[PDB]
Structure formats: structure tokens, C-alpha cells
Design a protein around this ligand. Structure first.
Ligand SMILES: [Ca+2]
Ligand SMILES: [Ca+2]
Ligand SMILES: [Ca+2]
Ligand SMILES: [Ca+2]
Length: 148
């Protein structure tokens, strides 16, 4: 996500927040959160609802206002994006979509990415990330090497 949000993104988040804010006073209370939680098939304890609210209540006034709500969703958005970007990238490399990146696929995709590696380089790159040593890179392995 990054930082600055677009007007449409903000306006949407406001519509959402509007659902949580059952009595529309501009702030979400534990009670209002519980109502929303339950309706989704959950049953948080009064202690959990207070934690959830408290963990998002930056100014400590007891409730969640729009900017507090927005900052939470923005962090969740960026987390999702980062993860989704890792998944997209893996898909690009996994040319045959079998769940693994092979040396041949790494060489191919790489070249087509403006990166031409030699045979030695290709194999070393695979080995460097190949934790279980089966000769190919699975998703967990790709993630591990990407976030490092
Ligand atoms: Ca309210
Ligand atoms: Ca607050
Ligand atoms: Ca593959
Ligand atoms: Ca492997």
C-alpha cells in the first residue's frame, strides 16, 4: 500500500466504519464491536472486546474513531499487499504452476526479467534457497529467501 491513500479508498473506509458505528456517533465502542463480531459467528469475551478496542484506541479515550480505524485497516491493507505481492512473484517464477520453482524456470523467468545468469549462478541460487534439498524452491522457501 505505502502511505497516502486515495480519496475513494478513504471514502470507502468511511462507509465501512459507518457499519461498525451502529449508533453513528463517530466512534466504535466495545459493545458495537461485539454486535459486529457476534453477527459474524464469533463470541469474544468482554475482556477480548476491550483489548481489541484498546489496542486500536490511540488517544485512549475508550473508543475507536475514524482515523484510528483507518490506520488499522491501512496496516492490514499493506500487510495483505506485501503477502499478495510475494504470492504473485512466486507465480511468475513457477512457470508451469506446479508449486515449485525449478532451476530451468529460474533461468527462464530471470532472463525474461532483464537478468541473464550463467548455469553456475542459476544452480547456486536454487541451492541457496533450497532448504529441504529436493532441488527445487517451494513457496515457504521462496518466502524465506525473499524476506531475507
Ligand atoms: Ca458509536
Ligand atoms: Ca479513540
Ligand atoms: Ca514450476
Ligand atoms: Ca526445496
Amino acid at each position: 500500500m505505502a502511505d497516502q491513500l486515495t480519496e475513494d479508498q478513504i471514502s470507502e473506509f468511511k462507509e465501512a466504519f459507518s457499519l461498525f458505528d451502529k449508533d453513528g456517533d463517530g466512534c466504535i465502542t466495545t459493545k458495537e464491536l461485539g454486535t459486529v463480531m457476534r453477527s459474524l459467528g464469533q463470541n469474544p469475551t468482554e475482556a477480548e472486546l476491550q483489548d481489541m478496542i484498546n489496542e486500536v484506541d490511540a488517544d485512549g479515550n475508550g473508543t475507536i474513531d475514524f482515523p484510528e480505524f483507518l490506520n488499522l485497516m491501512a496496516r492490514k491493507m499493506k500487510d495483505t499487499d506485501s503477502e499478495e505481492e510475494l504470492k504473485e512473484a512466486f507465480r511468475v517464477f513457477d512457470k508451469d504452476q506446479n508449486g515449485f520453482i525449478s532451476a530451468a524456470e529460474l533461468r527462464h523467468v530471470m532472463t525474461n526479467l532483464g537478468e541473464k545468469l550463467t548455469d553456475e549462478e542459476v544452480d547456486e541460487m536454487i541451492r541457496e534457497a533450497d532448504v529441504d534439498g529436493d532441488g527445487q524452491i517451494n513457496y515457504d522457501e521462496f518466502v524465506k529467501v525473499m524476506m531475507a
